[PDB]
């Protein structure tokens, strides 16, 4: 059932790195299957985040399995599938990876100052620092041993970010 | 938790009526969320479909509930959610409705003569007649009693269907 002929790409990196804004554009450009993973949490998770609370790792178990399932579905009918999922921790990455030998990660890498500048430029959006500091703390950048991780420089205008993304895709 | 100010539109209709192509531009242009519902089929379904066996109405139970779920999730954080899914039988429509008072359908409506010339329009595609008859055989036209169903006439070129879809959306 796994078409090793088709591929699935997971845009990752903290909140503010560019996942959504670049992924939209790439799928539109290569004309491909794109799925935002924020969309697959179980009804239980939506209420907990709505009740103002942070999901914990157990809550992410069923979500990432759903996403992994969704990875499975996209690559039956598309050669290029993009899924947005910040996936900061190396164990989430293994939850996605399992049974998907054809899934790989594209990591939109930047440092703090760059990503901070990016979110405060959100018109009307009040920017809270602790949130981004938790994102860096949680982030367990994939090492060299994570060999299905490709990497991208977000320090570049979106469109450059876009183009690089396409390259590492067509590379 | 149901944000009655954000809405989900399901692009329904037969296979061939433009569900995915129309929904991608409406998502692009409206800058809104788009989930294609093929991708939420349980690992079981991917295999039943792969082995070649059709799905019955039992195997869609779990899939449409996942989608209903997904609908819930998209409208927490977006005012306009579009979900592609054929939605042929009234029952499938009822199942997506459940829990989601803030959901609606946009019926990419056409007749047989039209959808067929279209599916045949792509090169290298070997078009099977029964496959679309069945489609129409299966179809349970949203009747006038289903008042969250809007309809868009497809006997119109791609762009007016995009434009009309957008109208029913902003209407
Ligand atoms: N290369 C770039 N240059 C300038 N702005 C960029 C950029 N890439 C993304 N942006 C903008 O930066 C902000 C981050 O957006 P984006 O929604 O894509 O990130 P994200 O999806 O990773 C955060 P979230 O997880 O909350 O969705 C947005 O304001 C976006 O328009
Ligand atoms: N209004 C229109 N004018 C011309 N071509 C159109 C059209 N709407 C759709 N198409 C084309 O018609 C065919 C059907 O595409 P599309 O993927 O949207 O159908 P669909 O989503 O209903 C297929 P399926 O349901 O099997 O997933 C494709 O060739 C698409 O490019
Ligand atoms: Mg995002
Ligand atoms: Mg389609």
UniProtKB/Swiss-Prot annotation, chains A, B:
Its EC number is 2.7.1.12. It comes from the Bacteria. One of its GO terms (biological process) is carbohydrate metabolic process. Pfam families: SKI. Pathway: Carbohydrate acid metabolism; D-gluconate degradation. InterPro entries: P-loop_NTPase, Shikimate/glucono_kinase, Therm_gnt_kin. It catalyses: D-gluconate + ATP = 6-phospho-D-gluconate + ADP + H(+). ATP binds at residues 13-20. One of its GO terms (molecular function) is gluconokinase activity. Keywords: ATP-binding, Kinase, Nucleotide-binding, Transferase. Belongs to the gluconokinase GntK/GntV family. This is Thermoresistant gluconokinase. It comes from Escherichia coli (strain K12). The gene is gntK.
